[PDB]
Ligand binder design. Structure first.
Ligand SMILES: *[P@@](=O)(CCCCCCCCCCC=C)OC(C)C
Ligand SMILES: *[C@@H]1O[C@H](CO)[C@@H](O)[C@H](O)[C@H]1NC(C)=O
Ligand SMILES: *[C@@H]1O[C@H](CO)[C@@H](O)[C@H](O)[C@H]1NC(C)=O
Ligand SMILES: *[C@@H]1O[C@H](CO)[C@@H](O)[C@H](O)[C@H]1NC(C)=O
Ligand SMILES: *[C@@H]1O[C@H](CO)[C@@H](O)[C@H](O)[C@H]1NC(C)=O
Length: 376
């Protein structure tokens, strides 16, 4: 069986922080830690009041001079478990089911004879950033793929979920064809937001507390806007009509050609700078140049557009289209476009009734991956 590298999505691996902060926003926030603690995922940090401590640690500071993000004064954030699976199997190191992400899939892989940290390895990254600020990650990923090729005697299967598919495409677009033909067996693409997702507009405008209803959407908006990855996943014109309205208000519409106005009108000009930094990273048309299995959920209501009676500090009414509840179905068109642009096979696989996250623990998804890895 071929070696496997797992690439997670946004929020898709643990992050750890170490503190030596000059000040804090509440007295009950820790100023200083002697070692790293888990900043994602730890539910006790997301309770009312305490979450102000968390936001102040996990937010990125955008520097207009350097056109780059930095951690707040006296904060370090690191990615544990690179080359291992623990940090993307469980987002919560207490291993509560709430943080269960790749765990079911890795249990299946190990059942099929894989070994954690050996011929199955994770490629976790700082998912708050876009690829322009994860250079070292891609060098480490190249080196790990080469090492696994050398140890286990064969090219590797990349398995990516959600935004991990965009990270993986960015990586493959920048490796020579000869390198990919040697080192990459296949790319199994799970719930890939090719061309971005509509849901980013609402996150940036009014915030999204859907998975944390005790906290105010305007409070979590501060953190969600600070993540470059959010602006990176705004809809692109290679998937969506430039005339498609994502946000309607009483006085103005916003299509994907209106992002500069959008960022001005929501009071977040840094987001426009982030979109300029990141919009060109993934080449619109250029396929990965490897055997590609495009698995996408359908039949789950998926936010498509937003109507705001009051903008931007109130929840909108939501208009839904087809998809997996997160990734719009239109994202799958991109796979179809690649059939005619690369010699390697592009196989499309609809997962009807498969929700974005549940598809990672779903018997039909795992049965598909098993056929790819162990053969007929
Ligand atoms: P995927 O990687 C793609 C879905 C993109 C939706 C972006 C919204 C941002 C959420 C909070 C922002 C804070 C960092 O999806 C994962 C698996 C959920
Ligand atoms: C912003 O970036 C530049 C270059 O790294 C530097 O002059 C400055 O220290 C940074 N600003 C802040 C507030 O950290
Ligand atoms: C498509 O989007 C890119 C930037 O993301 C833009 O530069 C380009 O002009 C657009 N092309 C159109 C609308 O024809
Ligand atoms: C936005 O366009 C919609 C249809 O796309 C239209 O009904 C509405 O009048 C427009 N809004 C504004 C403020 O022009
Ligand atoms: C698992 O995915 C399949 C394939 O689309 C789907 O039919 C089924 O509803 C899913 N199971 C669950 C529990 O969601």
């Amino acid at each position: 069986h071929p070696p496997v590298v797992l690439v997670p999505g946004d929020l898709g691996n643990q992050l750890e922080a170490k503190l030596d902060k000059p000040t804090v926003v509440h007295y009950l926030c820790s100023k200083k830690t002697e070692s790293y603690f888990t900043i994602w995922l730890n539910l006790e940090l997301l309770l009312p009041v305490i979450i102000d401590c968390w936001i102040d640690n996990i937010r990125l500071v955008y520097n207009k001079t350097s056109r780059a993000t930095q951690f707040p004064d006296g904060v370090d954030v690191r990615v544990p478990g690179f080359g291992k699976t623990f940090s993307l199997e469980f987002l919560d190191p207490s291993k509560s089911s709430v943080g269960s992400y790749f765990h079911t899939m890795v249990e299946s892989l190990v059942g099929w004879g894989y070994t954690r940290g050996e011929d199955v390895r994770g490629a976790p990254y700082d998912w708050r950033r876009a690829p322009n600020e994860n250079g070292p990650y891609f060098l480490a990923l190249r080196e790990m793929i080469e090492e696994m090729y050398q140890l286990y005697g064969g090219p590797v299967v990349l398995v990516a979920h959600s935004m991990g598919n965009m990270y993986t495409l960015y990586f493959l677009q920048r490796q020579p064809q000869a390198w990919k033909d040697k080192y990459i067996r296949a790319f199994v693409s799970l719930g890939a937001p090719w061309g971005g997702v509509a849901k980013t507009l609402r996150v940036l405008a009014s915030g999204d507390n859907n998975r944390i209803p005790v906290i105010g959407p305007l409070k979590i908006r501060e953190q969600q806007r600070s993540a470059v990855s959010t602006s990176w996943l705004l809809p692109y014109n290679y998937t969506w009509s430039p005339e498609k309205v994502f946000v309607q208000t009483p006085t103005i519409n916003y299509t994907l050609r209106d992002y500069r106005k959008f960022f001005q009108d929501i009071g977040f000009e840094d987001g426009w700078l982030m979109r300029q930094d990141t919009e060109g990273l993934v080449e619109a048309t250029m396929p990965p140049g490897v055997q590609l299995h495009c698995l996408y959920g359908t039949g789950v209501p998926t936010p498509d557009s937003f109507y705001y009676e009051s903008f931007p500090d109130r929840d909108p009414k939501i208009c839904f289209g087809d998809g997996d509840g997160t990734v719009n179905l239109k994202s799958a068109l991109q796979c179809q476009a690649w059939q005619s642009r690369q010699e390697h096979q592009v196989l499309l696989q609809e997962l009807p009734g498969s929700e974005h996250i549940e598809m990672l623990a779903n018997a039909t998804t795992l049965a598909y991956l098993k056929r790819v890895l162990l053969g007929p």
